[PDB]
Amino acid sequence: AQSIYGGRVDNEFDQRLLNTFLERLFTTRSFDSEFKLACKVDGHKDIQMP
Amino acid sequence: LKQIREVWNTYELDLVNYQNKCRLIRGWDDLFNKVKEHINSVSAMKLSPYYKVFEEDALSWEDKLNRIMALFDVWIDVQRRWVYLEGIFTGSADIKHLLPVETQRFQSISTEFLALMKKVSKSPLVMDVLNIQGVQRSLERLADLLGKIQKALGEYLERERSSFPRFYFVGDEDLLEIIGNSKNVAKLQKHFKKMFAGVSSIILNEDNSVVLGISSREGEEVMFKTPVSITEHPKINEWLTLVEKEMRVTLAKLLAESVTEVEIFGKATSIDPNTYITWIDKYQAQLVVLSAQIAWSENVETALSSMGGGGDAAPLHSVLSNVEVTLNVLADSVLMEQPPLRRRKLEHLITELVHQRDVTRSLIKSKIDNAKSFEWLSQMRFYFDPKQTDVLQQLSIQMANAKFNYGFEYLGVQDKLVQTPLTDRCYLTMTQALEARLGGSPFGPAGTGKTESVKALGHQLGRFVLVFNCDETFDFQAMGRIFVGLCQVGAWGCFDEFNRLEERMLSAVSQQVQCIQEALREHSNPNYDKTSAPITCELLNKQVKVSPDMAIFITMNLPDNLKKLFRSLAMTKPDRQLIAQVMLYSQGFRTAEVLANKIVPFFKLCDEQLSSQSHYDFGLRALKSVLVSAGNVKRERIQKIKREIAENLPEQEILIQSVCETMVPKLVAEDIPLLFSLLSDVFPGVQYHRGEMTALREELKKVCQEMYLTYGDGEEVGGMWVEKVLQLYQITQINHGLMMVGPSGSGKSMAWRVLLKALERLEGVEGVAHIIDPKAISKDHLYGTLDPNTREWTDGLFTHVLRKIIDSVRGELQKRQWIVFDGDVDPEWVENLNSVLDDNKLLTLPNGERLSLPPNVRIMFEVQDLKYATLATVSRCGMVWFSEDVLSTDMIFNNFLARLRSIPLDDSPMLQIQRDAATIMQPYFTSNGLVTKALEHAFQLEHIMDLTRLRCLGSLFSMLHQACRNVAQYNANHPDFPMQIEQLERYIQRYLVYAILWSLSGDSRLKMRAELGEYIRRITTVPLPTAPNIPIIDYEVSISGEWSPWQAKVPQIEVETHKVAAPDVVVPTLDTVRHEALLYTWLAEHKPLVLCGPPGSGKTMTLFSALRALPDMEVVGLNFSSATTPELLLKTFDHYCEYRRTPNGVVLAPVQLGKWLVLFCDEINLPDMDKYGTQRVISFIRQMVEHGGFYRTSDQTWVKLERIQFVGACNPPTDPGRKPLSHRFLRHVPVVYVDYPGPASLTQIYGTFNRAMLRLIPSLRTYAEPLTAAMVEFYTMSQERFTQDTQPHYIYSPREMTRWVRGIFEALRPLETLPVEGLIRIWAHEALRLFQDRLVEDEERRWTDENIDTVALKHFPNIDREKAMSRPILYSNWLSKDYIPVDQEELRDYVKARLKVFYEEELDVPLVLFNEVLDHVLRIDRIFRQPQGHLLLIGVSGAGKTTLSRFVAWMNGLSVYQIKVHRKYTGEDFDEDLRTVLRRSGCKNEKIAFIMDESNVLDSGFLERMNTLLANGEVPGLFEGDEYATLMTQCKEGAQKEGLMLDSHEELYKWFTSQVIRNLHVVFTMNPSPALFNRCVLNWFGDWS
Amino acid sequence: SGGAKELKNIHVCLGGLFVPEAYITATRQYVAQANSWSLEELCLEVNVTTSQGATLDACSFGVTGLKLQGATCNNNKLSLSNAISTALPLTQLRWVKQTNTEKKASVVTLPVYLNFTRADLIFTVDFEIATKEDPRSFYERGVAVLCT
Amino acid sequence: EFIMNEYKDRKITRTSFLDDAFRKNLESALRFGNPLLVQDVESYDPVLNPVLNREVRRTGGRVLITLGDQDIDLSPSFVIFLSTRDPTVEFPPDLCSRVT
């Protein structure tokens, strides 16, 4: 969030979006099999985790 | 070949003297370019088939030419190498030990070269030495030897740099100084600043044989644990490396001891402030901060290790409490007075402890226990281990996953940066990238903290960080060795702004950086982590070993070569709030959080609400400066309260007081109320109080009374001015180098002069100023130069002044010296002063000598708008804005009246009459009832130039002085019955009105003057002129004291018949005599002025006649071309003036004793503005006018002008090439708008000439008045229509009627017994050839014909029904002898026959004679018959203009001459051609046709040469020295062939001008400048029908 | 016609102003001069009205032209909508005493841009979201108030 | 290249106005009598105007061209070709009227 991908970010709000994505993906919860990579995909569908 | 053979017998070697008392050759230009020209000439002539004149001579001369080229090409390089290496081998000491083999080799080479120089000294002939055998071979051998020895010197320097890697930071000359001046270590001490990080001097033994220790610029001193002595280590590199190692070791030992001591303080709580201060004083600031960091980090780590299990008593709370206790102790300690070094250490400790607090307080107390946790691993953690024997391994700094070490390089004391979260992430990402062997590339808007953050990171790790600034501060020749040094010492690099480099520099340094980065990242290969063979890149074609410590940083605002090698971070928005809070807390301020929270938005508003000027700086640097100033103010208030703890002073008032005291001087008049509104918003209910300075104000008041100025206090008159003076004093106290900036017309100069007088009176310190104008003086002569061969240093003006002040002669420190730079600031010369304005306070001359100004000297600039100045110069010094609202009009009037009542004009009856006049005129100036109303009215009317208040009032004051002088003269003429009080009152009042009318709106059209007069009539009650249908401008205030019209003072003149329309014959008229009176008025006061008017409006004639009318005026006529330089004025002085040093100072006076020289300036606005919008000669003349002198470039001495007055004339600025004059120069010189003469004025001035010529034939004398009326009235209709908007050449002037009269007189000159219809037909012919051939449409021509017939009928009705004589109205003097009118067919046949003969005997293409060609031939013939007949052929190209001109010139026998213009044609060649044609026209009488094409005009200077050649008839700036002497001889001889006497040079020049007048016609062929349009007859040579 | 009073009463749009950030600053200064409050004691409070109520409270600054890109306003309570660019009529701008209280989880910081392209952050608005909605969804959907 | 091949028999020389040896090359070609190809005519040299105007002073069996000061013999078949490479340039009337 700070280095690497965060280095390119300039304003606060895209940094906030980057933080949101990073926390939603990079977590111990993602280890659970029924972890949604993206919720409400076309509404009814949801991307699961392999 | 004749010229080539004669010139080769006179060349001289031009021997000069050298510092080693030897001989040298000067003038490479003369001895190369002319020789190359001779080579070209011989090659061309032998190439050309007309070589059957000389065959063997040309080859001999050519081989001699090639021999000269070979010998001189070798000789110049040999001389340069010899002088440079002689300087190196003699000036530098210890050379006997430094490679003595090359010393003896150079001794032999120098012996041979000096033998050759003795030979060439005995024979100073160019070929006498060429004929000496063995010269060329010996010269080539010397060149080879010099090359070899120079290569040896270079390799020795490179070897020495390789020995000590830090020597790569210095240049070759400085390295030579270091390696040569081993005994004089004080010479080495100045170079230590560049090589090392912080040390500036090395503390040596008493006998200068043992290196006891080091120090720094600030004053911090480090004693070496083990001193190294130069005795047993004599080599410079050896003991320098030993000093470096000893510095590392001493730093390590002191760090270990300080850590041991700080463990005692950090054991628990209850820190004793007394012992804490002793510990701080004992250890260096770098070591103190390091010890605090190490203690805090190890304590937090131990506490976390304890907490790892869980809630184990929370020792983190204890660590936080200990940190809080230490912070409270430090906050208390800063409130008490401390030494500056201890203060800086204490502030660094406060900021670092604040960071250490914040970390634990917020990020760690959120339930963290693990010692391997990232949120603890994220922070920069210090680990000190003194067990390691190696110096560089004991201290280890680890950030995130990176594990750096601490290179123990002394950094002096550098200001630290508060660890903002932005700076925290910057450290994180830079450390992460450096771990991955990739340089960091932060980016963002400038002034956000990129370079400073990188430097702070480098200082944290102990790395020596080099900063390479971007703008104008790159030296690519040294960049390679800089990179080599960085890679060989493990230093850092931080480019301040990498994108500012232009493409070539950017690409080159980017390639170098790419190579460096690839070599660096080779150290972290996954399979080559263990580096066996050291990684080596390729710089300067050598394998430079790469040190892992080395790192490169670049900042954007990114190249493709470095995208894959550099990481980037955005620091666009810094954290101003936290920075301000921490800085205020470190300064002892209580409740710093609220103060920061208020101050940051205030500056953000100041970037928003206020206006936008370059000098404004609301950046982060300014905020920090304001904060430190506020800390100083708070400490000063605490100290003052003490002498009558005390933690009750209101902080907000202190903060706003610091803000105002720092910033208000830079504010404009409009912004100040806005600033106070913003203060009332952000800081409500808080008041700002000015410093009283009552001790200085009394002396200021006394000076103002004795300087006739007006003193004030607050809201009364002058309050703003005196406040500005006080702010100037404040800026003088704070810093050196301040510049006072404001619109021209404020009290800038007066402010500093008065304040210097006040300082001299009050403090008792004598103040001597040195006002220097740098624009007029050459920059090379401003600072100095080194001649290419001798390399002798001749100091410049400013250099000489600074050397005189620094030299222990007089007043080095007991007197305050104020170098005031008057003019405009621009990069060209402020480049040198950049190093003097900053904290370096040094002047590095090109010779190499470094000059530091003593503390008393203050380098002030006075400029007007500050728009072409580099931001570096502006930021390096403070400034105060002198708004135009400061200098109030009423205060101007008060100063004027006080000066008039005090200073006698003729420096008691004069003083009495002045006081009476002042008492009379008091109710007008001071009262805002007449003069102020008139001033604002004149400002809201239109004027030919921009209106400046100071000029418009200075002209008024000058005319009032003249009125007082007139009254004095009136009393002088009549001793009895003197000027009575009532007559005085009437005269002074009416003259005051008259002087307002001619000062205000005196440079505007007649309608504008009438509007001003009507407004005055509305706003005054004094006696106005009686007649209400005549402009007030027309009248004159008689010495009796009544309105008398100027027309009554207009006399009549009767010029002689042979002087009709003569070069210089002015006939008196209304405008002429009135402007003559005005010029006398201004010229009495020695006040320069310029007459501004349309071309050919009677400006030069009027002013020239006025000047020569005065008996004490000697006039020298100067022409100001575009390329006119101050050198022209200097030459005029050196020719017509003499320098004497007998007075207190050198004084320049005319050679003619008792004569007031005047340097008349043709087209004073013509000289072109330089690329910084300043005219060199204009600034030079302003320097002469204002300060009454200048500086001699020869000896840098102020010479004052005596009996020199400047008067000029110029066209309106709207015309092409007319750059408006500077406002500073404009206020000195009032201008008079000389408009085209009115109808009645033309009637009178030309009826004089009509009567004069018609007196020749008595019968026609009775028709003079109708002829004049018809001429002027026809010109009238021709002037309303056919304006310049329809056609650019449709301009009409009273010069056309002069040509008209001259032409009619020439026609009647040999003729006699003409009837009335004859005079009318000649008049009609001249009207047709002057007013109709210029037209471009047939409708215009028919309209002109109808008007000609109409005016002929209405003006004189007694002519026969024939229009003039017939329709064609033809004139030719070939058919008969006199200028008799001819018919159509006979003239056509004659012209056709002669044209057939012409193209048969000279040309090759047949010419057809159709109607247009015949008419144009007739016109050009008429032009050639009249001397000074100059023709303007406008028409399509290739239509026969040149051919027809040549044909008619051949018919009339005029020799044809034209310029052979090529691509590389220069001004000097054109002037030589002008000299040749003038010589053939003045002497050796020869009617010459000078046919110039539009393409022939290659430069505008040629057009100016034509402008001065045509109207005047001669070029004053063309004849110089030998040319003048030879032309004088030819003129004096040609005088006695034609029947005149030699007499004097002046009358012979007059006769030469007359001969050029009669024997030179210039014809201009142009394809479809207004000044060039006039003084030439315009012929619309239209395209073939 | 009215001097200072009308200069505040007018429902000036924010899209057309040349420097609308300067307008926000000027409004903040006006509210500060009112009651002599310090400039930093003021934070923007935004309520969306309708039908041009114009019930100004001597601190409300009715502004028009703001476009909510990505959701809708329901009595000042946001709600994600698939239909984008819902016009917001008369979003009243109020300034009140900042109590430095912790903002509840039902608030979001919406960046207010001028152009359709987002390259100029004029100011930020804190809206209350619906109960079911969450800040993460709003942040990722890209909602942002637009003046034009 | 078409002109180069066409007049290679006459040793046509390729040069440009930008070349500093342009005057020397012109003198050599004019004396010997060989065609010349001067490209880069945008920066036209006004020294060529006597040649373009065909001012032939056939005096005393010596046809000469007034090039600067030293007038050189006008050899027959002195064909100087002017050329350029850009199609957008507004030539001055002096050069335009003297060429096809």
Ligand SMILES: Nc1ncnc2c1ncn2[C@@H]1O[C@H](COP(=O)(O)OP(=O)(O)OP(=O)(O)O)[C@@H](O)[C@H]1O
């Ligand atoms: N009370 C006063 N204080 C200062 N100058 C005054 C005062 N009253 C009248 N003056 C006049 O105002 C002028 C101040 O201009 P000053 O000489 O200080 O400026 P400068 O640096 O020479 O030029 P400029 O300001 O036009 O660039 C002078 O002509 C001075 O006589």
Ligand SMILES: Nc1ncnc2c1ncn2[C@@H]1O[C@H](COP(=O)(O)OP(=O)(O)OP(=O)(O)O)[C@@H](O)[C@H]1O
């Ligand atoms: N009142 C006059 N009496 C006599 N001659 C006059 C008068 N007015 C104009 N002239 C004539 O008009 C001409 C003006 O002279 P001059 O060429 O010096 O003009 P100028 O205004 O100084 O020109 P420029 O602006 O080009 O320097 C002269 O020939 C002069 O004799």
Ligand SMILES: Nc1ncnc2c1ncn2[C@@H]1O[C@H](COP(=O)(O)OP(=O)(O)O)[C@@H](O)[C@H]1O
């Ligand atoms: N985080 C910070 N804390 C304190 N001062 C800072 C900080 N960042 C920048 N500064 C100050 O700003 C001034 C200029 O910063 P600079 O490094 O020139 O920025 P830039 O790299 O954009 O030119 C420096 O004098 C520095 O003291």
Ligand SMILES: Nc1ncnc2c1ncn2[C@@H]1O[C@H](COP(=O)(O)OP(=O)(O)O)[C@@H](O)[C@H]1O
């Ligand atoms: N009236 C004419 N009759 C025949 N040839 C003409 C005439 N006027 C011009 N020329 C031809 O034009 C050629 C060059 O004209 P030139 O004098 O250069 O025109 P310009 O002076 O307008 O450039 C000459 O060779 C001449 O033969």
